[PDB]
Amino acid sequence: SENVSLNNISMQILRELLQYRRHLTDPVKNSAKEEEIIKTVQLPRIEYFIKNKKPIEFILPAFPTKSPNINKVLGTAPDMAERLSLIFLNSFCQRIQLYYPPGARIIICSDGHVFGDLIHVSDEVISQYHEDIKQLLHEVGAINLSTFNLNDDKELCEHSDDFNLQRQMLVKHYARSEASIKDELLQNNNGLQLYRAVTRFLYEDSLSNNALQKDAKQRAIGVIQRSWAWGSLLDTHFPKAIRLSIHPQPADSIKFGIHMMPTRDDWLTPWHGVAANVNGQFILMKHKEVQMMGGKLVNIHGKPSHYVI
Numbered sequence: 609s610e611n612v613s614l615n616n617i618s619m620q621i622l623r624e625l626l627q628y629r630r631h632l633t634d635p636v637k638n639s640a641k642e643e644e645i646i647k648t649v650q651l652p653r654i655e656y657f658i659k660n661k662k663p664i665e666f667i668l669p670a671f672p673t674k675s676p677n678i679n680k681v682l683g684t685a686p687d688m689a690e691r692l693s694l695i696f697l698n699s700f701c702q703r704i705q706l707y708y709p710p711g712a713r714i715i716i717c718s719d720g721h722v723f724g725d726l727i728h729v730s731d732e733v734i735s736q737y738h739e740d741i742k743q744l745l746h747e748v749g750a751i752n753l754s755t756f757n758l759n760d761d762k763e764l765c766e767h768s769d770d771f772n773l774q775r776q777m778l779v780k781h782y783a784r785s786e787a788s789i790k791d792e793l794l795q796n797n798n799g800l801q802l803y804r805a806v807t808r809f810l811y812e813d814s815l816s817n818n819a820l821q822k823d824a825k826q827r828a829i830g831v832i833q834r835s836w837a838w839g840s841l842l843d844t845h846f847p848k849a850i851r852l853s854i855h856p857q858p859a860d861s862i863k864f865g866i867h868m869m870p871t872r873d874d875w876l877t878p879w880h881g882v883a884a885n886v887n888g889q890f891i892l893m894k895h896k897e898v899q900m901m902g903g904k905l906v907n908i909h910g911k912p913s914h915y916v917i
């Protein structure tokens with residue numbers, strides 16, 4: 609039949625994605641059955657675009673703001689690790705074109721303002737970080753990548769200002785009760801490990817140790833509640849889009865987690881790390897670990913960009 613050509617194209621795309629999959633690493637996991645499951649979830653969503661001879665569109669909520677802990681990152685502004693990551697995502701769409709002529713697009717849905725309050729990061733800085741990321745997309749020629757922000761939705765408040773109000777509106781319309789978020793979080797080991805990870809990152813950036821513990825635990829549920837709301841919003845806007853994610857994700861999930869630079873931490877993202885050249889390969893690592901390595905900082909455009917070891 610005529611499906612063999614279509615089924616060939618979709619499977620080449622899925623196989624390329626699988627090369628970059630972000631997942632909880634555990635050697636007791638059968639990887640072969642995991643991939644078999646992912647095939648059953650994503651191949652239909654992929655073929656929807658191929659049948660209609662439409663470019664494959666991907667959603668990725670990512671790059672909200674730079675982490676404020678200087679022990680983790682180099683500067684408030686986006687750095688090489690962000691640049692490498694954008695360059696990678698764009699070139700990922702570019703090669704789909706050789707297999708498929710329409711090619712693909714990735715909408716980066718920057719979640720910066722949605723949880724800005726809970727990160728204790730100025731909306732002014734988040735807006736600045738977003739602006740620079742659009743500027744990096746032009747610097748690099750990332751013609752397949754585009755940006756979606758809370759400001760963009762017509763339904764949520766018109767104004768960029770009163771982001772607080774935008775946050776309130778998003779939570780009322782698209783959020784879920786924190787108790788539901790916590791209850792759901794505590795069924796899976798998927799949800800368990802998300803909760804742990806998000807608390808850890810919130811703790812680290814915040815350095816009265818107990819008040820600091822219980823607070824990170826409470827803010828974590830908050831930040832997850834906001835981010836799932838954001839996803840709900842995206843889930844309505846771009847329903848047939850393939851859902852990329854910056855977090856590990858179970859194989860049955862609709863979301864597909866993805867890496868953008870080499871790293872040994874499944875939870876690391878370039879806005880929580882720096883770029884290190886070791887043995888001719890750039891890697892994503894926390895700022896402090898590189899300093900222990902003794903690698904020397906390299907500054908481009910004046911602002912520090914990366915560390916070379």
Ligand SMILES: CC(=O)[C@@H](O)[C@H](CO)N[C@@H](Cc1ccc(O)cc1)C(=O)O
Pocket residue numbers: 669670671672673674675676719727729805806809810813831832835854855875879
């Ligand atoms: C479920 C989530 O919403 C998070 O996982 C989130 C996704 O965007 N990434 C971060 C959160 C974070 C980001 C910027 C910052 O300055 C501080 C914290 C994380 O993993 O901890």
